[PDB]
């Protein structure tokens, strides 16, 4: 079934704008959505088919207090995305309240696309955590979608924000987003501003314009995470079929990223795998262990020897994984696209469930716990107090996320066989 992407918030709208542009050039599409004359791919899932081959992405663009939604409109690609579905504070509470009054018209825009498509399998959100308007509005829309589509599943390309710690309420906003995310999201893929900023400092000298350049880094991961769906093959055809292996228990569902050619601009499979497991290639910032790992490779990989390769990785004991029950490394292979320069033909990404990401969640919980005692930034803005007089959703969020922090470390233990 076709995937509908609910890109929301200025930051989220920036990475959806680029992700669709990235698949414009990668696929046979021009800036006006017209089939390219120069042009073997499954474009049905991501791109709606118009009568005259105007393959329009099924993007839902939500603008709140818009500024960069106006810049998106003055672009050569304005015609490419024309489902004609764009509808008009820095606080999580401020975003949640604004979303509630306009919920029905934004929700009808969701319906239109659902009716238009032959079918709808998942809602992929370009969410921004502690995103000012992006968070709060995104949590609320996350709660409505599951109730309306109980059978359907929701993924989140959460750009978890770590900038070395401006938002003084950033921990409070993030704390609330996760509680909604931990129980109202089927899957989440985690990214880190600092981890990518550190990569940007590593591969390039770019430091001050970190947000503009890092957009390309988030994009390469995003296009790549879907390439096994966007191009066809004998295994991992549909989204869910792929989602199951990466998330082994509903509570434990945040995914780490990695790209072997971080410096993207021959190499044997044995090499591209080893390079990935190294930590400089990783884009995320008591024993600790992965729960299950997966990898996808797109290039002139010799497909016959991707087995002999795995046997070697297994004996070098380069990876630990989990003691409770069975898990294993999983090799997957795809076609890099033609048309675009296939320089560095072999490029590999990995998506993995790792207990280290618990540490990033605890750091915002640490900032929040410190901030909660001080009550330095309760906002006490009438919106904040009137929306939350008890201020107990933050405590409800604190116990839920602490259960998650606890559940992760329980996975490290030998007995997730007993309750976690």
């Amino acid at each position: 079934r076709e995937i509908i992407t609910l890109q929301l918030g200025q930051c989220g709208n920036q990475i959806g704008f680029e992700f669709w542009k990235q698949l414009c050039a990668e696929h046979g599409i021009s800036p006006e959505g017209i089939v390219e004359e120069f042009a073997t791919d499954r474009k049905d899932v991501f791109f709606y088919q118009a009568d005259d081959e105007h393959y329009i992405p099924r993007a839902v663009l939500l603008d709140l207090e818009p500024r960069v939604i106006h810049s998106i409109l003055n672009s050569p690609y304005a015609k490419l995305y024309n489902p004609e579905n764009i509808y008009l504070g820095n606080n999580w509470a401020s975003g949640f309240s604004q979303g509630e009054k306009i919920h029905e018209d934004i929700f009808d825009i969701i319906d239109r696309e659902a009716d238009g498509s032959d079918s709808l399998e998942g809602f992929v959100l370009c969410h921004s955590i502690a995103g000012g308007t992006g968070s709060g509005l995104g949590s609320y829309l996350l709660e409505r979608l599951n109730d309306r589509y109980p059978k359907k599943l929701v993924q989140t390309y959460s750009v978890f924000p770590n900038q070395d710690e401006d938002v003084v309420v950033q921990p409070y906003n993030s704390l609330l987003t996760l509680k909604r995310l931990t129980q109202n999201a089927d899957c989440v893929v985690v990214l880190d501003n600092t981890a990518l900023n550190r990569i940007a400092t590593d591969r390039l000298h770019i430091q001050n314009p970190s947000f503009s350049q890092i957009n390309q880094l988030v994009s390469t991961i995003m296009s790549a995470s879907t390439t096994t769906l966007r191009y066809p093959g004998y295994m991992n055809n549909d989204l869910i079929g792929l989602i199951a292996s990466l998330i082994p228990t509903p509570r434990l569902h945040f995914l780490m990223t990695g790209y072997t050619p971080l410096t993207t601009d021959k190499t044997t499979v044995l090499d591209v795998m080893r390079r990935l497991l190294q930590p400089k290639n990783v884009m995320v910032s008591t024993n600790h262990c992965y729960i299950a790992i997966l990898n996808i490779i797109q290039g002139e990989v010799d497909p016959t020897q991707v087995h002999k390769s795995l046997q070697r990785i297994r004996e070098r004991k380069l990876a630990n994984f989990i003691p409770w029950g069975p898990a294993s490394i999983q090799v997957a292979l795809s076609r890099k696209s033609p048309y675009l320069p296939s320089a560095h033909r072999v490029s590999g990404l990995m998506m993995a469930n790792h207990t280290s990401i618990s540490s990033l969640f605890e750091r915002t919980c640490r900032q929040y716990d410190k901030l909660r005692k001080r009550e330095a930034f309760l906002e006490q803005f009438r919106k904040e107090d009137m929306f939350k007089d008890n201020f107990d959703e933050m405590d409800t969020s604190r116990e839920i996320v602490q259960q998650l922090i606890d559940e992760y470390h329980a996975a490290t233990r030998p007995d997730y066989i007993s309750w976690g």
Binding site: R42, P232, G233, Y234, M235, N237, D238
Partner: protein, 60 residues
């Protein structure tokens, strides 16, 4: 061999005798299995071929 490979395309078939019959097509085989679920879950001692030939066509 030349004539066999342009007047009967002996090779283009081998490429499409694995792509479709051995499940290598991948996508065709998952949208057929989705649309064929209600009909198949019923005992086929009572199944008629006119509804199978009709649904494969939708899938292709």
């Amino acid at each position: 061999l030349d004539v066999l490979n342009k007047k009967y395309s002996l090779l283009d078939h081998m490429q499409a005798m694995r792509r479709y019959l051995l499940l290598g097509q991948g996508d065709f085989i998952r949208h057929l299995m989705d649309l064929l679920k209600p009909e198949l879950v019923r005992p086929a001692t009572t199944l008629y071929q006119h509804n199978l030939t009709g649904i494969l066509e939708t899938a292709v």
